[PDB]
Amino acid sequence: SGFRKMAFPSGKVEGCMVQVTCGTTTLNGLWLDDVVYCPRHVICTSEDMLNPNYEDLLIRKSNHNFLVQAGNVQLRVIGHSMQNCVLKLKVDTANPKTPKYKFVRIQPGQTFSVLACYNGSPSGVYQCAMRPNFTIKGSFLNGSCGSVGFNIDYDCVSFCYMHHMELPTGVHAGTDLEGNFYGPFVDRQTAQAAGTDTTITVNVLAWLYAAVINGDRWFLNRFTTTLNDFNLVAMKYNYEPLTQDHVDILGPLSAQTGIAVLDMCASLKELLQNGMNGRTILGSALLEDEFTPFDVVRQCSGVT
Amino acid sequence: SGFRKMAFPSGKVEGCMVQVTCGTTTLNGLWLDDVVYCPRHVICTSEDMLNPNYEDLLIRKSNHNFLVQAGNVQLRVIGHSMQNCVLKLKVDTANPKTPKYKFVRIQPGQTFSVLACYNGSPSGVYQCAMRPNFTIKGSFLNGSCGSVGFNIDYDCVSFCYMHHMELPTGVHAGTDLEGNFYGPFVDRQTAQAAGTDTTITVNVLAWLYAAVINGDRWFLNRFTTTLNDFNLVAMKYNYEPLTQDHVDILGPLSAQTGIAVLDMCASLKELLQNGMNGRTILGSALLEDEFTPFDVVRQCSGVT
Ligand SMILES: *CC(=O)N1CCC[C@@H](N(CC2CCCCC2)[C@H]2CC[C@H](O)CC2)C1
Ligand SMILES: *CC(=O)N1CCC[C@@H](N(CC2CCCCC2)[C@H]2CC[C@H](O)CC2)C1
Numbered sequence: 001s002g003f004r005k006m007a008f009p010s011g012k013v014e015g016c017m018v019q020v021t022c023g024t025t026t027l028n029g030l031w032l033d034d035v036v037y038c039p040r041h042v043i044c045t046s047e048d049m050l051n052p053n054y055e056d057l058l059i060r061k062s063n064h065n066f067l068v069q070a071g072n073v074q075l076r077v078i079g080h081s082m083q084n085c086v087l088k089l090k091v092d093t094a095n096p097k098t099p100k101y102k103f104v105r106i107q108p109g110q111t112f113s114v115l116a117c118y119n120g121s122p123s124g125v126y127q128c129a130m131r132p133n134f135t136i137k138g139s140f141l142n143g144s145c146g147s148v149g150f151n152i153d154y155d156c157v158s159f160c161y162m163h164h165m166e167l168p169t170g171v172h173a174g175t176d177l178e179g180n181f182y183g184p185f186v187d188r189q190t191a192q193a194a195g196t197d198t199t200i201t202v203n204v205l206a207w208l209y210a211a212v213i214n215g216d217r218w219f220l221n222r223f224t225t226t227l228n229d230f231n232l233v234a235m236k237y238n239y240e241p242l243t244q245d246h247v248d249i250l251g252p253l254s255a256q257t258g259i260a261v262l263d264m265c266a267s268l269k270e271l272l273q274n275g276m277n278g279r280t281i282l283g284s285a286l287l288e289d290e291f292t293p294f295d296v297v298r299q300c301s302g303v304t
Numbered sequence: 305s306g307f308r309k310m311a312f313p314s315g316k317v318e319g320c321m322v323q324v325t326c327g328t329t330t331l332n333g334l335w336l337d338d339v340v341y342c343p344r345h346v347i348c349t350s351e352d353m354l355n356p357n358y359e360d361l362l363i364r365k366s367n368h369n370f371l372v373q374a375g376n377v378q379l380r381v382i383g384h385s386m387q388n389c390v391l392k393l394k395v396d397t398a399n400p401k402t403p404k405y406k407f408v409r410i411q412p413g414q415t416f417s418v419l420a421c422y423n424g425s426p427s428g429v430y431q432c433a434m435r436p437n438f439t440i441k442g443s444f445l446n447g448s449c450g451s452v453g454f455n456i457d458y459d460c461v462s463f464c465y466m467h468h469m470e471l472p473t474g475v476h477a478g479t480d481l482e483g484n485f486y487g488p489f490v491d492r493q494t495a496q497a498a499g500t501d502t503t504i505t506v507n508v509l510a511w512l513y514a515a516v517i518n519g520d521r522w523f524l525n526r527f528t529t530t531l532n533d534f535n536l537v538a539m540k541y542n543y544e545p546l547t548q549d550h551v552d553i554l555g556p557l558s559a560q561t562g563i564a565v566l567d568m569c570a571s572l573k574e575l576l577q578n579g580m581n582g583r584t585i586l587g588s589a590l591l592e593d594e595f596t597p598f599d600v601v602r603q604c605s606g607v608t
Contacts, residue, residue, distance in 0.1 A: 001474045004443040006428035009419060011315035115313060121608035124310035125429055137587065139308040141606045170305045170519065215474065276589075278579070283441065285580075285589030302445045304425035 003210050003282045005290065006299060007113035007127040008152040015097030018075070019120030020089070020146065021067040028117040028146030029068060029089070030159070030177075032098050036068050036075065036089040037177060038146045039164045040082050041187050049189040058082055063089075069120060070095070084179030085164065085187050099157050103177035106160040108132045109200040109240070111292050112149040114161070119143060129203065129290040130161075132240055133195040134183025135171040138163070149174075154304075167194055199239045199289050202246040205264050206293040209253035211281045213300050218279060220259070223266040230265040237272045249293045307514050307586045309594065310603060311417035311431040312456040319401030322379070323424030324393070324450065325371040332421040332450030333372060333393070334463070334481075336402050340372050340379065340393040341481060342450045343468045344386050345491050353493040362386055367393075373424060374399070388483030389468065389491050403461050407481035410464040412436045413504040413544070415596050416453040418465070423447060433507065433594040434465075436544055437499040438487025439475040442467070453478075458608075471498055503543045503593050506550040509568050510597040513557035515585045517604050522583060524563070527570040534569040541576045553597045 020029040020038045023045065029038035043061055044052040061080065066089050068075040079090030106112060111129045115122050116139060128136050128149075140147065140163055149161030163174045164187055171194055173185040185192055208219070225233075231241045247261045254261050268287075276285055291299075324333040324342045327349065333342035347365055348356040365384065370393050372379040383394030410416060415433045419426050420443060432440050432453075444451065444467055453465030467478045468491055475498055477489040489496055512523070529537075535545045551565045558565050572591075580589055595603075 001445075001470060002441060002443040002476065004428075004430040004432070005309060006420070006430045006443060007311060009315075009318050009426035009429055010313045011318040011426070014313050014315040116310070118606045118608045122313035122315070123606060123608040124308075124603070125313055126308040126310045128308070137306060139306040139310060139603060141305075141604075143606060166305060172306065275582070280590065286584065299428070299443060300445075302422045302427060302447060304422045304427040 001214050003214050003299065005127050007125045008150065010113065010115045010122065010125040012099035012152065012157050013115045013148065013150055014122045015099070016095060017115070017117050017120050017122055018068055018070045021069075022061065022065055026119060027143065028120055030146070030148055030162070031068075031070060031075070031091070031095040032101055034091050034094045036091055037162065038087050038089070039162065039175075039187065040085050040087045040179070041145070041164065042087060051188055051190070054082060058087075071120070082179075085175050085181060086162065086177070086179030100155050101157045101159060104158040104160050105176040105178075105180070106130050108134060109203060109292070111290055111295055112151050112160050114138055114149045114163075115147060116140060116144055117147045127290065129200060130182060131171075131197050132200060133197040134185075135167065135173055135194045135197070136161070138172040140166060140172055148177075167192055169194060196238070199237070199287065201234055201239045201242050201268075201289075202249065203289040203292055204239070204287045205242075205246075205250055205261070205268060206253060206296045207282065207288045207291045208264055208268060209250070209257055209259070210291065210296045210300060212257050212259060214282065216281050219267050219271055219281060221267055221270055223270065224260070224263050225266040225269055226262065227265075230262070230269055233269045233272055239272070252297055253293060305518050307518050307603065309431050311429045312454065314417065314419045314426065314429040316403035316456065316461050317419045317452065317454055318426045319403070320399060321419070321421050321424050321426055322372055322374045325373075326365065326369055330423060331447065332424055334450070334452055334466070335372075335374060335379070335395070335399040336405055338395050338398045340395055341466065342391050342393070343466065343479075343491065344389050344391045344483070345449070345468065346391060355492055355494070358386060362391075375424070386483075389479050389485060390466065390481070390483030404459050405461045405463060408455075408462040408464050409480040409482075409484070410434050412438060413507060413596070415594055415599055416455050416464050418442055418453045418467075419451060420444060420448055421451045431594065433504060434486060435475075435501050436504060437501040438489075439471065439477055439498045439501070440465070442476040444470060444476055452481075471496055473498060500542070503541070503591065505538055505543045505546050505572075505593075506553065507593040507596055508543070508591045509546075509550075509554055509565070509572060510557060510600045511586065511592045511595045512568055512572060513554070513561055513563070514595065514600045514604060516561050516563060518586065520585050523571050523575055523585060525571055525574055527574065528564070528567050529570040529573055530566065531569075534566070534573055537573045537576055543576070556601055557597060
């Protein structure tokens, strides 16, 4: 028993981290097979960071200008290209530590682990969620750009995120591994609006099921509700509307605990309307939304 | 910016996990050089788990009874011995993935990462603290025994914990890598009292400094206090007494922020006496104590 914000073991990803330098800018790259992936803003300078013309900036760069270092060994760059907001540097050596991998574009509300890196060196790993507004609340300092987010299914790493920037509000924005930003963000030093964020309702319900499984049951009540009544409350409290797809994904947890999804919705409704009254659930004094129903089943069953 | 409960990258530890089976019991082992370390309770059975005579039980076991598997390859056991509550199985092959390592006995209040494992396979990584009562609030299911806790200093892994058991209260107990339990716990299926736990005051103050660095400053007030006055409040709220050693370790954070340690103690005093009034600090609605002053500096400076 016990419930923790657990990240995937980062080993398969640590073996892929490299340092990329262009001019005087250094950030992280991801070395998979004979390609190194990194944020294209590695080619920009302070003079043009307000509105870089990446096409023109990349034209002034040659293969030998991209310095790629894997630990202490230098990689030879034999090709370079820009795909959306990522640079793909073809190298002459395939990474011997390349795990089985996929590039995936995650949905908002889904979770992933982040391996924060500096100078191509891993510093730490944490679990987070892609917010409904397509930002992530990470921990990233200068030099963390190019750090990636991922999920692991047995031996396969699905890379889903590459860090590009911190908004003036302290939240983080990035791309999938094809260089497409999550959300409306652009890779330029400008004030950018992150939309109204909402709480991931299906994840809070999944976490409430995790709480019941682990013995924290005080919030269970003698009430039920309907999807429509619940959604009136969800809208009032800036929670995502619950759909029948969300109810269906909660099926296994409803089955294991014997608590119907709409009965758990009534418990959640009461917690939203009345607060926690100074109590905690799984060591938290607020409603946690960064655990998916998949994460709860995985953690509560022991998926390695 | 941003503040997360970050674990160390687990790669160096993943390379050391093996599966150990004895009779019909399977748990995890840690393969370092030519030795595999695991909980000695791997040799016990349901009939004798209430009070095992480990000396007598180990005498009925031979080297060939200990099945050690590293992924898909079987290791040859050429020696076996019990040191306190751990079994040391000498193998004929040194682990080629053995990182630079040390065995350390951590102090209560110190933090470490845990690589939860099942059948010798890593499932996830999380950061936790050794409670003042020598328990850890982990996430461990059946088969997680032998999973280890560690810290990483550049290329050196300091192993500090090996998981042995879950108390009837759902908290976790284990040993250092010499097999000595943290706390008064014994490796037997009996009701065991975990003492009164207290909040790690120096860590809460370190986290308050992390909050200030990241912009969460609402809790700062126009007051100061003394070590003696503060400790009267700490005792009332089951917080560890703050010593001058704790004030000294907070020195760097006091210097960076310009907030004297006793002024931060007055902010903490007010938060204890008045609560959070429905507000949050670093995304938490309670006072976090599982970040040491070292963790706050590391995360806020980018130590890889
Ligand atoms: C995140 C990271 O590691 N890096 C590499 C170093 C430069 C850095 N920033 C520049 C770019 C410009 C284009 C849009 C994204 C950010 C700067 C911005 C100014 C700040 O004062 C320091 C980091 C990105
Ligand atoms: C934690 C773990 O992986 N393992 C291996 C499988 C047996 C397990 N437990 C037995 C020992 C007995 C000695 C004291 C520590 C626990 C059992 C206890 C009973 C429970 O119902 C299942 C796990 C330890």
